[PDB]
């Protein structure tokens, strides 16, 4: 939970929101449709929107590998401040810069 978390937005709405009000760097966290109960990060980068699933194992949260965190907010806050730690599978850096709404 915090100023990027949208408790009631779909993936689609999220990428329309990011493509209309966001800028390159804008992100939010939302509920996951594939895994009800979990959250997803959506980020506007390059000329599109990237969606990253967040694993809640039942013990911790992570990005299906990488650093683990006790709450969802510690996850996001970490990747927002630690430069270069969020990367796609292919190695390109994902930037978590502007918390939307």
């Amino acid at each position: 939970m915090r100023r990027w978390f949208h408790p009631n937005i779909t993936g689609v709405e999220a990428e329309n929101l990011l493509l209309t009000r966001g800028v390159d760097g804008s992100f939010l966290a939302r509920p996951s449709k594939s895994n009800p109960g979990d959250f997803t990060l959506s980020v506007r980068r390059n000329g599109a929107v990237t969606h990253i699933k967040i694993q809640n194992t039942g013990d911790y949260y992570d990005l299906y590998g990488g650093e683990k965190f006790a709450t969802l907010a510690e996850l996001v806050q970490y990747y927002m401040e630690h430069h270069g730690q969020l990367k796609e599978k292919n190695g390109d850096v994902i930037e978590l810069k502007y918390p939307l709404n």
């Binding site: 997803t40 929107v49 969606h51 990253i52 990005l63 990488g66 990367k87 796609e88 994902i94």
Partner: peptide, 9 residues
């Protein structure tokens, strides 16, 4: 639905 991006640790 939407498309997902895996992350590299």
């Amino acid at each position: 639905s939407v498309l997902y991006t895996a992350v590299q640790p």
